[PDB]
Design an enzyme around this catalytic site. Structure first.
Site, PDB file in Angstrom:
ATOM      1  N   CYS A  53       0.835  -1.195   0.000  1.00  0.00           N
ATOM      2  CA  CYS A  53       0.000   0.000   0.000  1.00  0.00           C
ATOM      3  C   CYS A  53       0.875   1.252   0.000  1.00  0.00           C
ATOM      4  O   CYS A  53       0.921   2.001   0.976  1.00  0.00           O
ATOM      5  CB  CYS A  53      -0.944  -0.006   1.209  1.00  0.00           C
ATOM      6  SG  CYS A  53      -2.031   1.433   1.308  1.00  0.00           S
ATOM      7  N   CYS A  56       3.516   4.330  -4.878  1.00  0.00           N
ATOM      8  CA  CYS A  56       4.184   3.888  -6.098  1.00  0.00           C
ATOM      9  C   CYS A  56       3.805   2.443  -6.430  1.00  0.00           C
ATOM     10  O   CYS A  56       4.528   1.752  -7.147  1.00  0.00           O
ATOM     11  CB  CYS A  56       5.704   4.018  -5.928  1.00  0.00           C
ATOM     12  SG  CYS A  56       6.250   5.692  -5.517  1.00  0.00           S
TER      13      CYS A  56
END
Length: 128
Positions: A53, A56
């Site tokens: 999470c 990127c």
């Protein structure tokens, strides 16, 4: 409509902001101190890790979505002592990650896996 695919490939954290926002990090000796002894009737959500999470990869957890609204009514805490807590064994959970909900020294609910429909159901049940 059958869409269902998790990812236990690993964990990935990128807490750009924490102390002061809504997602704070806590340790062992203060875990219960501020979590279980919380008599403010506020809803505390303690979580282990973030399953890729990151901004990127996939920064889209349920916690942000609800916390952004309920920030004054909820507090998310990173349990640093994730390596050694049989609390998960108590719940008998097998998922990555897991979030527990405490309030008034009471246990309300626990976010297992990634089910937004479920988390809104349990969270909104215990807060306005």
């Amino acid at each position: 409509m059958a869409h269902h695919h998790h990812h236990h490939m690993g964990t990935l954290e990128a807490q750009t902001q924490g102390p002061g926002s809504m997602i704070e990090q806590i340790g062992d000796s203060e875990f219960d101190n501020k979590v279980t002894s919380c008599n403010d009737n506020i809803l505390i959500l303690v979580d282990f890790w973030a399953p890729w999470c990151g901004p990127c990869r996939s920064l889209e957890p349920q916690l942000e979505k609800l916390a952004q609204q309920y920030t004054e009514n909820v507090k998310i805490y990173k349990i640093n002592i994730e390596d050694n807590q049989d609390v998960a064994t108590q719940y008998g959970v097998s998922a990555i990650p897991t979030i527990l909900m405490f309030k008034n020294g009471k246990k309300l609910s626990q976010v297992i896996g990634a089910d937004i429909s479920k988390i809104i159901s349990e969270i909104n049940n215990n807060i306005n």
